[PDB]
Amino acid sequence: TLGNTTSSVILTNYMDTQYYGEIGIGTPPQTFKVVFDTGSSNVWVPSSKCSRLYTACVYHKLFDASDSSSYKHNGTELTLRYSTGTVSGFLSQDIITVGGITVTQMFGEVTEMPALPFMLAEFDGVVGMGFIEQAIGRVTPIFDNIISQGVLKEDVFSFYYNRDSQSLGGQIVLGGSDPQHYEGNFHYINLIKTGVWQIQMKGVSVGSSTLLCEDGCLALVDTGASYISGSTSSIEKLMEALGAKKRLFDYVVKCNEGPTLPDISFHLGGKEYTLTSADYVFQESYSSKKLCTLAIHAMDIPPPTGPTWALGATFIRKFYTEFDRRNNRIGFALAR
Numbered sequence: 001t002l003g004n005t006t007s008s009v010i011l012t013n014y015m016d017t018q019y020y021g022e023i024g025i026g027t028p029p030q031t032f033k034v035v036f037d038t039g040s041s042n043v044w045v046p047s048s049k050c051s052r053l054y055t056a057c058v059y060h061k062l063f064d065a066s067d068s069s070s071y072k073h074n075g076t077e078l079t080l081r082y083s084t085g086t087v088s089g090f091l092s093q094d095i096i097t098v099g100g101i102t103v104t105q106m107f108g109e110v111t112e113m114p115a116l117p118f119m120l121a122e123f124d125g126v127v128g129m130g131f132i133e134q135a136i137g138r139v140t141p142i143f144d145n146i147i148s149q150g151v152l153k154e155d156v157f158s159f160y161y162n163r164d165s166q167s168l169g170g171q172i173v174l175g176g177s178d179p180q181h182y183e184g185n186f187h188y189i190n191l192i193k194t195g196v197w198q199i200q201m202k203g204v205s206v207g208s209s210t211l212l213c214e215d216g217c218l219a220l221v222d223t224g225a226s227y228i229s230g231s232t233s234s235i236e237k238l239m240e241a242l243g244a245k246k247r248l249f250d251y252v253v254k255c256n257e258g259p260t261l262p263d264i265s266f267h268l269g270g271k272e273y274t275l276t277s278a279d280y281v282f283q284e285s286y287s288s289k290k291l292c293t294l295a296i297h298a299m300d301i302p303p304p305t306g307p308t309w310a311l312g313a314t315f316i317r318k319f320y321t322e323f324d325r326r327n328n329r330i331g332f333a334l335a336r
């Protein structure tokens with residue numbers, strides 16, 4: 001069912017690494033800073049029932065079911081594993097407010113939240129924008145519940161991620177896109193298969209020559225990821241071509257050599273999506289005596305999803321992204 005309503009959620013841009021919005025859960029609403037994540041399909045917030053021995057639960061907003069009159073118990077255990085760490089807890093149901101839209105949603109109340117990486121998290125929880133096929137405990141994702149309401153003008157959602165500030169951090173439009181944040185026309189790439197926000201990549205070129213992904217590879221479009229990521233071997237070849245040194249968690253170049261770095265192009269659909277060094281270097285200085293981080297990391301993603309590249313915030317900053325549930329495709333346009 002299609003309505004006449006589009007809903008927007010204003011996002012906060014923390015250091016160009018974290019983009020999050022606000023949602024309300026329960027009656028009266030308990031507000032949480034959440035990541036809208038295309039790489040996952042579960043909604044979770046930290047629980048009041050999380051041991052205060054987990055320091056992350058001391059520094060984040062906790063959901064207290066004892067303060068919500070609209071809360072409905074479930075208690076089924078859930079464990080969500082990511083490339084960065086793991087969260088566990090139990091299922092609960094309540095009313096969630098997302099930019100005006102009020103929806104009854106099943107979500108996870110996280111009772112085990114590790115310091116690494118959640119002590120570095122500015123957001124409290126996650127709102128998965130993925131498909132039911134990837135949902136742990138096959139819980140209906142929030143977008144599927146919003147579609148069911150038949151209020152949205154279109155069965156699509158769009159992401160705008162700005163470049164760091166003091167104005168707009170970003171914006172998610174549910175039910176459409178915002179022309180004020182893109183220019184030209186969208187160019188779509190169909191999903192390999194329904195259930196995952198993943199598309200086929202024809203090649204990755206450093207400078208002018210198609211150095212990587214020559215025989216084709218996979219590209220996951222992940223709004224919940226900070227960087228552009230490839231397999232350990234791919235990133236090794238990429239970095240050798242850039243003249244970068246491997247560190248514990250990141251790759252770096254001396255700050256002075258940052259602006260001289262070549263363009264990186266991603267062949268998706270018909271078009272070549274090019275990022276210059278300004279789009280992928282954290283140019284904190286211009287000094288030969290300092291190290292500058294690159295917004296490209298190695299991440300070995302396992303089967304069935306992987307081995308795959310992941311196009312995170314580094315990519316979305318340059319390209320305004322539309323996620324089409326109706327046509328199982330992702331559109332890209334140059335961000336304004």
Ligand SMILES: COCCCOc1cc(C(=O)N(C[C@@H]2CNC[C@H]2OC(=O)NCc2ccccc2)C(C)C)ccc1OC
Nearest residue numbers: 017018019035039082083084117120121224225226305313
């Ligand atoms: C752009 O600003 C958003 C916030 C960025 O800051 C952070 C992100 C994460 C994080 O890692 N995630 C979960 C990933 C994104 N989706 C999938 C998952 O990672 C995979 O596990 N990716 C690989 C994968 C993806 C899909 C299927 C299989 C495997 C948060 C919970 C949303 C952890 C700590 C952070 O800051 C200190």
Ligand SMILES: *[C@@H]1O[C@H](CO)[C@@H](O)[C@H](O)[C@H]1NC(C)=O
Nearest residue numbers: 073074075076091106138139
């Ligand atoms: C929890 O929710 C699921 C939804 O699929 C339901 O099947 C299950 O019976 C519920 N459990 C309880 C204890 O209410």
